[model samples]
Each structure stands twice: as structure tokens, then as C-alpha cells.
Target: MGKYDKQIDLSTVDLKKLRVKELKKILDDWGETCKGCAEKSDYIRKINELMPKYAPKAASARTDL
Candidate 1:
């Protein structure tokens, strides 16, 4: 596997590969917390939210050019 960047170049990594604890770590790094979360689908939702916030320039989602 490649190195983990603290700068957190998100958007590409698979959220499904990450566990709940790891989700907390990544979510917390961005000054967020999760308690109301239900674990499995919980972090999935949180990650989806955070990804858009940090990955705005993932223009490939729209303009591949």
C-alpha cells in the first residue's frame, strides 16, 4: 500500500475499506465528531459529507477535460 498523507488527499480512497475507529480519526482531523453515528452506514454518511467539503476540485467528477 502507499503512504498515508497527513494532508489527507481524500476523494480517491475507498471509504468502505475504513473501519469505524479509522473513520473517527479521519473525521476528527477535520474538526468533526461522530456519536449519533450508527457505525457501518454511519461513517459512510459522514465520509460522504466530509469528502465533498475537502474534495471540491475533484473536477473529474464532472469535467474530465
Candidate 2:
């Protein structure tokens, strides 16, 4: 497992419960640009949209080459 293997699963998390610093971390972790996300809601919206696409998947979802 890599350093990010233990990252929090943001897919099903309640974004409203998180602080701005936490939200920033999530955005950084996902390598997402925060150009227009000057407000908290904007960050929340972007993170929610990216969660399913960038968040780690279940072990069963992976296949060996």
C-alpha cells in the first residue's frame, strides 16, 4: 500500500461536517484544481463530483494483469 492507501473515503462522507482545511486536503489529495472554488460550497460541490471518479475502489473491483 502507498501513502495514500489510508486516505479517507470521501465518497460517502458528509462534506458539511468538514472544515475548510479538511476540504482543501481532499482537493489536493485528488489532484483537483481549486481555481474557481473560492467558497466552501464550491469546494464541496467539486469534491462530491470527483469522489466516485478519484476515490479508491474496493479490493474486489481490482484485477491483476
Candidate 3:
């Protein structure tokens, strides 16, 4: 399984209260520093590259809320 397969689970909570667009803005506000730290950045980039592999599949996450 690819790294994104394990990382992009819909069940994973997005604690940020903003919408996706706003969340992206927030990331940008951080000056893209999140994408610079070698260790975490490399791992995150790998997951991003793997996202398209699972985009069409319905998530198994339970929407119990």
C-alpha cells in the first residue's frame, strides 16, 4: 500500500474549524514552512503524490456524528 493509502483516511479528524479553502490559506499563512522541514515535509510530499491513487474510492470512515 502507498503512503497516502495509510495517511489520507477520511476517518482522520481535521481539527481545524475552517473549510478546505480556508485551511489552505492557513497553511499559506505559515509561510510554507510546513513544506520545508526535511523530515516531515518529505513524508507529507510522499503522501500528496499518492493521493490521486485513492481519490475515487469511497472512504470506509464511519460518519457516526
Best by lDDT: 2
Clashes of each: 0, 0, 0
Tell me how candidate 2 scores on lDDT. 0.70
When 2 and 3 are scored with lDDT, the better candidate is 2
Per-residue lDDT tens digits of candidate 2, residues 1-65?
Answer: 56566454553466799988888898798788577567888888877677677765521233467
Q: Which stretches of candidate 3 lie over 4 Å from their true place?
A: 1-38, 57-65
- Cα-based lDDT at residue 58, candidate 1: 38
- Candidate 1 lDDT by residue in tens digits, 1-65: 46664554454666688788777877787787777767577887876777667656431354467
List clashing residue pairs in candidate 3. none
For model 2, the stretches where C-alpha displacement exceeds 4 angstroms are 1-12, 56-65
User: If both were scored by lDDT, which would come out higher, candidate 1 or candidate 2?
Assistant: 2
| CA RMSD per model (angstroms) | 4.4, 7.4, 12.3
C-alpha lDDT of residue 25 in model 1: 76
Q: How well does each candidate superpose onto the true structure, as a TM-score? A: 0.60, 0.61, 0.28
Candidate lDDT (C-alpha), each: 0.67, 0.70, 0.41
lDDT, ranked from best to worst: 2, 1, 3
Tell me how many residue pairs clash in candidate 2. 0
| Residue 26, candidate 1: C-alpha displacement in angstroms | 1.5
Q: Give the TM-score of candidate 1.
A: 0.60
